[PDB]
Amino acid sequence: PNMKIIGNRIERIRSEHAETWFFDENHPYRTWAYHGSYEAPLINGVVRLLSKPWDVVTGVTGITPYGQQRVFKEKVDTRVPDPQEGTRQVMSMVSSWLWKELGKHKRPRVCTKEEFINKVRSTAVEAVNDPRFWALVDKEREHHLRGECQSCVYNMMGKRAIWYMWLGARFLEFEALGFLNEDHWMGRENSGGGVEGLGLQRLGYVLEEMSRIPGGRMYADDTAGWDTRISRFDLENEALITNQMEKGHRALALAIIKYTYQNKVVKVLRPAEKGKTVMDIISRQDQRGSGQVVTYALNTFTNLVVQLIRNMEAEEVLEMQDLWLLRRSEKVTNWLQSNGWDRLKRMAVSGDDCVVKPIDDRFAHALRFLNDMGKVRKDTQEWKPSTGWDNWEEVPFCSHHFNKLHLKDGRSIVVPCRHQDELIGRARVSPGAGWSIRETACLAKSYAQMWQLLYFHRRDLRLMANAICSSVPVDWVPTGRTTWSIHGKGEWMTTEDMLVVWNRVWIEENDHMEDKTPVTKWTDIPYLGKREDLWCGSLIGHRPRTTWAENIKNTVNMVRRIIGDEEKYMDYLS
Ligand SMILES: [Zn+2]
Ligand SMILES: [Zn+2]
């Protein structure tokens, strides 16, 4: 461990728990440095009541110190092996080229306290309105400008692993690197292959556009445990963005990168004897600390780099000898300057997910650089060629597939779809304990309106959404977080009529809809074919679902009585 960079944080934690601090020789950490330990100490009722048939669907009901330790042994206690020197030379060249393209029409900048407060306002609200929080933030920034870090420490939670950091550390990351998100550096117009800021209502059109580019099949390979495969070399290559920063901003960003990305200090819970719990203090110099302000943007960047490299190997620009040491590097510069933009426009990359439309199917067996970079494909033998898709409507991307549907008048739209159990299961989860009827119903309304905008083509979701919206007062504003996906843009977070929002999103503002004729009734908005709806998890035709549909108005009346019969309600079912 680099005690010169993490030592201050470990010593600070040790001094805060000095009387219970101890070194456990029987700790379970294999690839993380261990420093010591100390002693340490959910249903949305509205959605549940309106989704009775799914109480026995394991796909729905399925989705702590023991939990944190399980994710360590199953996923995070691993070390990605170093790529060879030539592979590292290619990764650095491609990353340098890509940063220069992304920065051609954009300038890095510091993000402000005002920008952060505005994003928070959408107990974090209490902290941003307290001057003592900003004083703690200022003390840590002063340490950073002096080459020190005292409190940027992760808190592991898990259940993929989720790494939490105190709001002030997240502010310092946002100040230095938030411009990647706020100024849309990974937007498609700026990056060619990125899709940041496109909603699920548009991603399908990107895949359809890619299908028309001449080339091989569409490949959408997943890397097994992407965040654990981000190496110290990937982090150094991502850090090249600091070369485009002015000196003051550069100092802030280098502190975030060096002290919190390239060196990390984490707190993890672990069960101990007699039902007691300990907190372990560990560290490491690689992996992506999933949950950072710029995890998505940096994962998108590095996945773009990986896919450009796999295309160069497929096109026989890179040879086997180049893994050991890159020979004739001008060939890589030429390929990037000549073909890089064309190959970026042949990709759709969102964090660790990608779809590539290579110039031919040599991409399927171009595995040497991919495997040497440790970006090993999930659910496939390491050296077996990839299998691509001939039909863009079957390609998985961002946990969805995309289907062309036809409106009653002959026009077509391209909609997002996924297996329905995950959609209902997520809506049935309420975040945090102590949620009242007002907060629970507003969050149920947000899921229901999101379904009306994006998944209206699924029979069960259109009906369940109409039942939820009929059970929650119409003047209640949808609240909470409907998804963690950057592609759920929140047009459904409104009291504007969802048929109006549907028309704005799918017709008026949809650049892929040439005819702007409005759709004036929900009965003119299509469903998937019954067999497609069933393939993706519908319960149509299943007796408990038929009973639920026939009883739905009774169920809505029951919920209205619970919330209060005096509220303003709208009948969305008739
Ligand atoms: Zn710090
Ligand atoms: Zn589907």
UniProtKB/Swiss-Prot annotation:
A motif (Nuclear localization signal (NLS)) lies at residues 104-110. Replicates the viral (+) and (-) RNA genome, and performs the capping of genomes in the cytoplasm. Once sufficient NS5 is expressed, binds to the cap-proximal structure and inhibits further translation of the viral genome. Besides its role in RNA genome replication, also prevents the establishment of a cellular antiviral state by blocking the interferon-alpha/beta (IFN-alpha/beta) signaling pathway. It catalyses: a 5'-end (5'-triphosphoguanosine)-ribonucleoside in mRNA + S-adenosyl-L-methionine = a 5'-end (N(7)-methyl 5'-triphosphoguanosine)-ribonucleoside in mRNA + S-adenosyl-L-homocysteine; a 5'-end (N(7)-methyl 5'-triphosphoguanosine)-ribonucleoside in mRNA + S-adenosyl-L-methionine = a 5'-end (N(7)-methyl 5'-triphosphoguanosine)-(2'-O-methyl-ribonucleoside) in mRNA + S-adenosyl-L-homocysteine + H(+). It is a peripheral membrane protein. Zn(2+) 2 binds at residues 401, 417, 536. Phosphorylated on serines residues. This phosphorylation may trigger NS5 nuclear localization. Homodimer; dimerization may negatively regulate the GTase activity, a crucial step in the capping process. Interacts with host STAT2; this interaction inhibits the phosphorylation of the latter, and, when all viral proteins are present (polyprotein), targets STAT2 for degradation. Interacts with host TBK1 and IKBKE; these interactions lead to the inhibition of the host RIG-I signaling pathway. Interacts with host PAF1 complex; the interaction may prevent the recruitment of the host PAF1 complex to interferon-responsive genes, and thus reduces the immune response. This is RNA-directed RNA polymerase NS5. It comes from Zika virus (isolate ZIKV/Human/French Polynesia/10087PF/2013) (ZIKV). Comprises a methyltransferase (MTase) in the N-terminal region and an RNA-dependent RNA polymerase in the C-terminal region. Residues 216-366 form the RdRp catalytic domain. Zn(2+) 1 binds at residues 140, 144, 149, 152. It is found in: Host endoplasmic reticulum membrane; Host nucleus.
